[PDB]
Structure 1
Amino acid sequence: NEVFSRPEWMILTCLPVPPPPVRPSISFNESQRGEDDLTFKLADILKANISLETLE
């Protein structure tokens, strides 16, 4: 589609991050806090991007 879906948009150049409601944090046990797998994967992606930027 000319406006709705162009072929050049198929390459990911900007990655949106889901809001906290999409990936909430569980209660875990008492005095313990954990994060969803989405948060850890997003942090890994951000670390990889930062490493690539610094290396370039």
Structure 2
Amino acid sequence: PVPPLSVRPAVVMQGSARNQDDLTHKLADIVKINNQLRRNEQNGAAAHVIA
């Protein structure tokens, strides 16, 4: 379960740079490796790579 935006608000700094929450960065890592694993299982990858 990925929480809503209220639990991880993207606070805007003095300028326009929108800083993301720690939860959002972590979910970014999770989605990155999840997609990476999904393609590695779908396409050519070694068993140790998938592991």
| TM > 0.5 fold call | yes
**How far 1:31 moved relative to its partner?**
2.1
Partner of 1:31: 16
Partner of 1:46: 31
* Aligned counterparts of 2:9 and 2:19: Cα–Cα separation in 1: 10
Query: Deviations 1:11-50 (Å, cap 9, x if unpaired)?
Result: xxxxx01000000011212122111111010011001011
Structure with more of its chain in helix, by fraction? 2
Q: TM-score, normalised by structure 2?
A: 0.72
Greater Cα radius of gyration, structure 1 or 2 = 1
Aligned residues: 41
Q: Pick 1 or 2: higher relative contact order, CA cutoff 8 A, min separation 6.
A: 2
* Aligned counterparts of 1:36 and 1:28: Cα–Cα separation in 2: 12
Give structure 2 stretches of 5+ with no counterpart: 42-51
Determine what percentage of the aligned residue pairs are the same residue: 54
